[PDB]
Amino acid sequence: SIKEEVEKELNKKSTAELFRKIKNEKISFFLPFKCLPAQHRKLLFISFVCAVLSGGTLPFFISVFGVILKNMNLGDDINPIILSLVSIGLVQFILSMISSYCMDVITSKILKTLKLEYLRSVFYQDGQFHDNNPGSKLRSDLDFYLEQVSSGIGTKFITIFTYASSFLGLYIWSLIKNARLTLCITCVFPLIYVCGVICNKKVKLNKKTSLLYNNNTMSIIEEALMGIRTVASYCGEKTILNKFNLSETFYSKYILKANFVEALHIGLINGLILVSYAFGFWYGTRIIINSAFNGASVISILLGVLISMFMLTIILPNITEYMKALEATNSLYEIINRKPLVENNDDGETLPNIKKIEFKNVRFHYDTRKDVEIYKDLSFTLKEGKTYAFVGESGCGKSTILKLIERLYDPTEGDIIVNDSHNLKDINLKWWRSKIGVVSQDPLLFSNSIKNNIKYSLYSLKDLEAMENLEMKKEYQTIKDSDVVDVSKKVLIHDFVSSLPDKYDTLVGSNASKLSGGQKQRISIARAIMRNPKILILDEATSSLDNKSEYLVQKTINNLKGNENRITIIIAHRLSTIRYANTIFVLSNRNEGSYIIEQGTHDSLMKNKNGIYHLMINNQKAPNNLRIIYKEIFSYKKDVTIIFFSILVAGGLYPVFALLYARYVSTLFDFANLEYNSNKYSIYILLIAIAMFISETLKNYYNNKIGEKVEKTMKRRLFENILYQEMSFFDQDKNTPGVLSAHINRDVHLLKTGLVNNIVIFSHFIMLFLVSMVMSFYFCPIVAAVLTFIYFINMRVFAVRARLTKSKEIEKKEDPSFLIQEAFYNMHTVINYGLEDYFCNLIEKAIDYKNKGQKRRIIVNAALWGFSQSAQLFINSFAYWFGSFLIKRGTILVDDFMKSLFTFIFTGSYAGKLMSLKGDSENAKLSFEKYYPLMIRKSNIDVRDDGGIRINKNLIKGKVDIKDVNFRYISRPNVPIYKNLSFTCDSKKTTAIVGETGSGKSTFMNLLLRFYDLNGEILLDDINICDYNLRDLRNLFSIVSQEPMLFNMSIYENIKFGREDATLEDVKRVSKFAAIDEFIESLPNKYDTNVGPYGKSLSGGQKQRIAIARALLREPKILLLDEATSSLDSNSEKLIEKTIVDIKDKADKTIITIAHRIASIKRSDKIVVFNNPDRNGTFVQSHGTHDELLSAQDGIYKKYVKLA
């Protein structure tokens, strides 16, 4: 979107801001490297030194460059120095390779470790944290941090040192060779950084004010799209567009000012370099002539200084990423360093046996709703060898009971006394959980096999066997299956499993999906049984069973072992499950705390008294698409020629600088008549600078100008088309507001930052390409041919970075992903049993597949990166050798070679610099193809059409006649609504309507304003509605909806909505007649106050009276009311009813109403009611009563006089 882009642009703090931000909080730079062995702590030194060496390369190359040129011009050999490059290049390659390996063996390790540590903390959550940050969010966080640290810690941390070393070569070498020259050169760049700083603020100050005018448009759009119906009826299509257009302009002008300043500064940058070169050569020559020191030594200075100040452009970004990654990890660290509150030691002193588990006034609140206490006087005791039972709903608080028995929530005052001399906190957690069997509402298991799902609890038991006195992987095979076998016959799951083969050898689906729900419950129950359940707890277990499965489970559990000493619980909705019970506790808070209310059994309370249980058992018992765009563009003429000119200049004049540099180099080695040449060339360089500045500036500025004008003219057509569309269009599902605003706010901005930004680049690149390939071959065909062959085959067959990024992205997408996803669903079941079974299993399933792909990826990619760094050296050397080999045998001179070379090189480099500013085009070429039909679609109801009968307000009758209707919504053309409707309203005569609620009453008004065209036969004054030229038809009705809708504009306009030709005095008189101008007169900005969006700064009564006065202004002939006083407070409702009766006293308008206030209905001179006896539709029962037929026959009016 647009807002996100600008927020990203503005919320981009510098390195100084980050430095001051990290200064106070004191993040350790040792933070990412903490879990390292000392092995890696030494290994890291290798890549450190293997970096600094490779960055001490270029100073040598530069200190031999000038001597190559001197040795070449005046006829001598160059062979030794060539070797003194090539060997050096080789060592660079080696070092580069090595460094890669080191990173891709460090990072992964210190990555992987932290993963498990994070994961560990998730399995020591103290219950409440499962509610705080539940599940998937954490995965939406975790992986994010990985991509924020696996892309800011690798090679991009070390390269800077190389560059630093390179800096720390060049300048100081240039400093020892000479002093004054490089100072007089470098004096200028501070004046560049100054301009950059000064221009950034002038960008931002306009950028924000551009946003102050945007969001207003968004509000205008959405606020209008919700209020489509009132806008349609009241004819405010035009006034909105004025607001929209008046808002666009401020935005456009500000953003264009910003773009202008930006292009200006960029041009200045492309200008100053040339003045730098010129003054450099001039001053150097002058001090040579004053000397009587070589000239070649000058050449090696300049480039070096320049390239030095290139490195500062490219160092700084990488740093930020590292720092970014750094703070990211800090977050995760304080997540591992949390302090859960129910953490274990497996060391709490446990007892021999269980007796006297007592409770006293459980007082506990939810963590969020601290001001909502849950239980008040819950107290009881649970002695060994006793059964119990409970009944309730699924939100009363039994979840907290289960969490208390399980030690997940720790109540404040309620005690957990057990055995009368020990606390559950003194007692071990895991010994407590070892002897517990629970089966929740839904069964929850894992996806390996049935027997191993069962043996998980057994593993949890063997843990206690081996811990208090790595055997775990061995003893688990000691556990057998026959227990599961002879208990599987008891739960009657032998036929389903015997049917298909592979009884338990089969692997069951995700969360054991292949079983039925009841069968998964059978297996969960068998698990609970096999784990020595000292207590069995069901949590709405039978809430989703048919009768047979529940009864079989009941027979299974009622006579189950350990009945001498256990606490069996059976919770459910139906009560027959507790037809037998030794004790039943029931509670309620009948609103700040519950407590036990009743006790008893089934028979001794079903027919004993009229308590709660008795009441419950008694009651319940393509081409042209874009050619359109190109047409709209080339209609512009003044701003196409100028971009064309500046393109030609900036393209076909930069290569000239290459040969100009060459012609200076040659004459720099001829001591005679050297001054005149120096002048004659330096001046030309100045002129080139002057031209390039202007050309680039105007290029960028008019580019942005054109894009802006296109967007402005585009949104207008789209919005002005979509506004007038019909209503059934909006009735569709996929015709949503949000999608449409998204189109308007995204696709067009892509259309600017897409097409027009990409076409210019292609034009400029192609121009430079053609001029160079036409220029070089004229001087030296052989060299240019071979060079083009080399770069072609290199970049299109040995494309190193492309293949590298392919490897990175195809690897970044990535079965531990299956297990890790499976875990966070069955969090409950791992808390039931098994914490470190998977802590170690995931490590294995990761490392088994890590290394084999790791070796191939690293051994392939490190060499690619190494060769990527050490190519241009070899190319330049090969070029010089081939050149001299031709020169000495005398086939081509030196100057043609020099010229062709420099042209080719500088143009290639600059085109590489320039291509990295493109934008997205495919998505923009696709969006247009998507939303083009909407800005052309035919509405089928257009007010703009003026072909029909004209009507004048002076001669309106107000008679209506209807015969029959069978209407069917488009949401469901399967069940009709209206059937055989017919009635009348003669003239200035009330007609009150009352029907069954939801009987389609408030759809009839849609038929009148043609919101839904059409079986059905209307007659207004004995002509059908469809030939009245509806432009006028919506200027004499008026509506008072169930809810009004106020717009962000002030009162004076909303009340003037529709009719601008409305003086303030009309507003005053119609307000006093509306009985409203008493609160408004007593406030500043009387007819000027700005309400909020949707009038959220207002009441209901004032809103309604305003909505009514907005209708009264037109003096509409046929008023249409519908239920305007539903649920208002006393005084406003009173004033409103007063105004209604005041209006209805005057029989000057044919009023229609829908109300249920019999005191006002009786005055109605007509009654017509709509019944819906059976679900077929609606039709009339009574007619022509008008209070003369009070209760004479069976109907609904008799009801609405006695019922109502």
Ligand X SMILES: O[C@H](c1cc(C(F)(F)F)nc2c(C(F)(F)F)cccc12)[C@@H]1CCCCN1
Residues that bind ligand X (CB under 6 A): 307, 310, 872, 909, 912-913
Q: Shortest Cβ distance from residue 189 to ligand X (Å)?
A: 16
Q: Shortest Cβ distance from residue 765 to ligand X (Å)?
A: 14
Q: Shortest Cβ distance from residue 904 to ligand X (Å)?
A: 12
997 is in an annotated binding site: yes
Q: Which long-range contacts (CB under 8 A, 24 or more apart) does 83-90 make?
A: 85/61, 85/873, 85/877, 86/874, 86/877, 88/57, 88/60, 89/57, 89/870, 89/873, 89/874, 89/877
Structure tokens at 554: 């009941």
- CB neighbours of 1026 closer than 8 A, spacing ≥ 6? 1013
972 is in an annotated binding site: yes
Q: Shortest Cβ distance from residue 903 to ligand X (Å)?
A: 14
Do residues 1135 and 1071 touch, judged by C-beta distance below 8 A?
A: no
Q: Shortest Cβ distance from residue 104 to ligand X (Å)?
A: 21
853 is in an annotated binding site: no
Do residues 808 and 875 touch, judged by C-beta distance below 8 A?
A: no
Do residues 432 and 418 touch, judged by C-beta distance below 8 A?
A: no
Closest CB to ligand X among residues 401, 650: 650
Do residues 403 and 355 touch, judged by C-beta distance below 8 A?
A: no
Q: Shortest Cβ distance from residue 9 to ligand X (Å)?
A: 24
Closest CB to ligand X among residues 228, 307: 307
440 is in an annotated binding site: no
Q: How many CB atoms lie within 10 A of CB 87?
A: 8
Give 3-state DSSP helix, strand, coil % of the chain, rounded to 5.
60, 5, 35
Q: Shortest Cβ distance from residue 163 to ligand X (Å)?
A: 9
Distance, CA of 174 to CA of 299 (rounded, Å): 11
Closest CB to ligand X among residues 270, 1041: 270
1001 is in an annotated binding site: yes
1002 is in an annotated binding site: yes
Closest CB to ligand X among residues 801, 937: 801
516 is in an annotated binding site: yes
148 is in an annotated binding site: no
Closest CB to ligand X among residues 163, 702: 163
- CB neighbours of 269 closer than 8 A, spacing ≥ 6? 192
Could you tell me which of 1020, 1033, 1024, 1022 has the C-alpha nearest to residue 951? 1033
400 is in an annotated binding site: yes
Q: How many CB atoms lie within 10 A of CB 114?
A: 21
396 is in an annotated binding site: yes
Could you tell me which of 1181, 1203, 1180, 1179 has the C-alpha nearest to residue 1193? 1181
Closest CB to ligand X among residues 901, 992: 901
Q: Shortest Cβ distance from residue 91 to ligand X (Å)?
A: 16
Closest CB to ligand X among residues 308, 695: 308
Closest CB to ligand X among residues 340, 912: 912
Closest CB to ligand X among residues 14, 872: 872
Q: Which residue is nearest to ligand X (CB)?
A: 909
Closest CB to ligand X among residues 67, 311: 311
Q: Shortest Cβ distance from residue 241 to ligand X (Å)?
A: 48
Beta bridge partners of 538: 439
Closest CB to ligand X among residues 913, 950: 913
Structure tokens at 1017: 């036969």
- CB neighbours of 118 closer than 8 A, spacing ≥ 6? 142, 332, 335, 336
Structure tokens at 1014: 């059409």
Q: Shortest Cβ distance from residue 872 to ligand X (Å)?
A: 4
Closest CB to ligand X among residues 308, 704: 308
947 is in an annotated binding site: no
Q: Shortest Cβ distance from residue 752 to ligand X (Å)?
A: 27
398 is in an annotated binding site: yes
Distance, CA of 282 to CA of 267 (rounded, Å): 24
Between vectors from CA 168 to CA 164 and to CA 171, what angle results, nearest 5°?
Answer: 125
DSSP structure string for 322-337: HHHHHHHHHHHHHHHT
Q: Shortest Cβ distance from residue 330 to ligand X (Å)?
A: 34
- CB neighbours of 990 closer than 8 A, spacing ≥ 6? 1144, 1147, 1151, 1152, 1153, 1163, 1164, 1165, 1166
Q: Shortest Cβ distance from residue 166 to ligand X (Å)?
A: 8
1042 is in an annotated binding site: yes
969 is in an annotated binding site: yes
Element of type H or E holding 160: helix 159-177
DSSP structure string for 580-606: S-S--EEEE-----BEEEEE--SHHHH
366 is in an annotated binding site: yes
394 is in an annotated binding site: yes
725 is in an annotated binding site: no
Q: Shortest Cβ distance from residue 747 to ligand X (Å)?
A: 33
Question: What is the β-pairing status of strands 960-965 and 984-985?
Answer: antiparallel
1099 is in an annotated binding site: yes
The gap from C-alpha 638 to its chain's centroid, in whole angstroms, comes to 42
Element of type H or E holding 240: helix 237-291
Closest CB to ligand X among residues 453, 869: 869
Give the 3-state secondary structure of residue 1054.
helix
Q: Shortest Cβ distance from residue 315 to ligand X (Å)?
A: 13
Element of type H or E holding 927: helix 922-931
1050 is in an annotated binding site: no
Backbone angles phi, psi at 343, to 5 degrees: -65, 150
Structure tokens at 587: 């509670």
Closest CB to ligand X among residues 136, 909: 909
Closest CB to ligand X among residues 279, 310: 310
Tell me the Ramachandran region of residue 1177: left when phi exceeds 0, alpha when psi lies from -120 to 50, beta otherwise: left
**What is the sign of the dihedral through the CA atoms of 348, 351, 353 and 354?**
negative
Give the 3-state secondary structure of residue 568.
strand
Do residues 98 and 47 touch, judged by C-beta distance below 8 A?
A: yes
1102 is in an annotated binding site: yes
Q: Which residues are annotated as a binding site?
A: 366, 368-369, 394, 396-400, 441, 514, 516, 518-519, 969, 972, 997-998, 1000-1003, 1042, 1098-1099, 1101-1102
Q: Which residues are annotated as a binding site for Mg(2+)?
A: 441, 1002, 1042
Q: Which residues are annotated as a binding site for ATP?
A: 366, 368-369, 394, 396-400, 441, 514, 516, 518-519, 969, 972, 997-998, 1000-1003, 1042, 1098-1099, 1101-1102
